């Protein structure tokens, strides 16, 4: 059962720099002492990532409220978190995030992972209530307040926890890249202890694969699940929750890039180059080497990627008379076959299979999938 929190009030965005972070292993082939070029969805180097504290204390009175915004999922996301008290517990992925469409649940309690794909009726503010026991205090019992109801479950997965026990300046950087390609949700992660660096650290850590989930759902938006150590019925004046949100999480969006990954002798990706970043990296990607010599080098294009697409078709309104062609009361014989010209209309075959089933449909010189986004000069049936 869900609990209503306060209005988020739409805090203004804040950005920070991700110095060469988010690189994952693209394949499962051991590569040693080689420079491999892969074109895939990577976080661009030195990008602006959106940073949100888990608990923000911004009011004049001193209100503490979770910053749990629902954020978009554009072709993948890099979620980095710097916390010290396990206040971040997981995520939810979906399009509408209600009972109409399927959604993905990832939640981490003290013992294992719960991964479920159901039709969850998520409330506006999903969180886990966390209370320590009276005598032990070694683990934290969790009360799940994420969804009102769950139906039509088609997936279930449990394993060892994604987030390790963090039970005092020992912050940790946990990083995960989430991708939804061809019906599999792929998760890639690395855990590194950090020290005295408030923001994302400068350095290179490669994200090893974690799991490939055959969820087979459509994902457009995501939210972050947080742990509520304080009480919603009585908010403390201060110190009831975790230190006014020193803990924080970072969100970056993947984009199609070409990376030159350098695998070392032990098989590890030790360095990468973003070919689209500066001209030196374009020269490095053209020469397939991390060291270039003195001189002038002609470089191939890696710098520009199209972001928008335009479609321009003639001003045609009426639908093609496929009812006359296909649903005629009598057809011609094969020795005198009937040829009909089709012109000045829109060729929509999606109205055909409402009631007509075609045993044979073979297209020569054109693919049937590319038949929608094409214009024909003359058509003869």
């Amino acid at each position, epitope marked *: 059962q869900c609990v209503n929190l306060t209005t988020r009030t739409q805090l203004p965005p804040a950005y920070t720099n991700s110095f060469t972070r988010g690189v994952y292993y693209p394949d499962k082939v051991f590569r040693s002492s080689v420079l491999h070029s892969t074109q895939d969805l990577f976080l661009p180097f030195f990008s602006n990532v959106t940073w949100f504290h888990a608990i923000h204390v911004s009011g004049t009175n001193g209100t503490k409220r979770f910053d749990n915004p629902v954020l978009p999922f554009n072709d993948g996301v890099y979620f980095a978190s710097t916390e010290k008290s396990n206040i971040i517990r997981g995520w939810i992925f979906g399009t509408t995030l209600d009972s109409k469409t399927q959604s993905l649940l990832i939640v981490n309690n003290a013992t294992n992972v719960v991964i479920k794909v159901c039709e969850f009726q998520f409330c506006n503010d999903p969180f886990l*209530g966390v209370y*320590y026991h009276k005598n032990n205090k070694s683990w934290m019992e969790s009360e799940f307040r994420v969804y009102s109801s769950a139906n039509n479950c088609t997936f279930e997965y449990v394993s060892q926890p994604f987030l390790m026990d963090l039970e005092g300046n020992f912050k940790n950087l946990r990083e995960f890249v989430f991708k939804n390609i061809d019906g599999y949700f792929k998760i890639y992660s690395k855990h590194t202890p950090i020290n005295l660096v408030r923001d994302l650290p400068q350095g290179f850590s490669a994200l090893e694969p974690l799991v490939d989930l055959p969820i087979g759902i459509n994902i457009t938006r995501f939210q972050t699940l947080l742990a509520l150590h*304080r009480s919603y019925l009585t908010p*403390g004046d201060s110190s009831s929750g975790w230190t006014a949100g020193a803990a924080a999480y970072y969100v970056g969006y993947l984009q199609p890039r070409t990376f030159l990954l350098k695998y070392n002798e032990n098989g590890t990706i030790t360095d990468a180059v973003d070919c689209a970043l500066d001209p030196l990296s374009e020269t490095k990607c053209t020469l397939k080497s991390f060291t270039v010599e003195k001189g002038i080098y002609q470089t191939s294009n890696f710098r520009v990627q199209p972001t928008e697409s335009i479609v321009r078709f003639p001003n045609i309104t009426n639908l093609c008379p496929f009812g006359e062609v296909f649903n005629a009361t009598r057809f011609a014989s094969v020795y005198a076959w009937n040829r009909k010209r089709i012109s000045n209309c829109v060729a929509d075959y999606s109205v055909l299979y409402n009631s007509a089933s075609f045993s044979t449909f073979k297209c020569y010189g054109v693919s049937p999938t590319k038949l929608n986004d094409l214009c024909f000069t003359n058509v003869y049936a």
Partner: antibody
Amino acid sequence: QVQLVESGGGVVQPGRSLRLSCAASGFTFSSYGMHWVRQAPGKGLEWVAVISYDGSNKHYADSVKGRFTISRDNSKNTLYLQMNSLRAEDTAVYYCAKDSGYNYGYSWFDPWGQGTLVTVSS
Amino acid sequence: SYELTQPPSVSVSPGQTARITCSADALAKQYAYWYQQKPGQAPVLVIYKDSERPSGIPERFSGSSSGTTVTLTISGVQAEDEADYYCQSTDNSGTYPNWVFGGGTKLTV
């Protein structure tokens, strides 16, 4: 002297609505949650209702779920227990108490109002 | 859901100790609280978190827990302590939090 004085309690026939008004003084009323606890004559205490600090959340005992409604006015620092469709078992000395814990799993009632006697007359 | 088991009554002579114990299966894993309801007066908090005494309560009152059982003992039974004593624990078992009380003890000086 975080003081909670209630009023608005009296005899009633079953199946009639009665509204209890618990006032507050001497403390930040909006910063603290509040409860209602009834004590039947000759019997022990029993919790009935919850209201959040803001008033954004409220739960009721399974015996009196939905039959009462609870609300607070943060401007007038007054607590309200609007009761409808009273039955014979509802006779008690209703107490307005204040939630006293800042941690999620556990809570208690440090201050308590003097009490209003709600009597049902068959 | 779970019910706290509290004795109906105790009889203690003055100038002695008076231990009030109530036990439940969840009391070993959750805190318990003690209130005193003098006849004709509202209940007042006496011991909270199984050991902690708020200010304004005399030093006689002390509390401790022993696994399943939690206890409330009085270091000297004055006549002013003749009242009703209750337990409280919070059941998080249901969809929403619940507050369970005890039967109460009739302490006679």
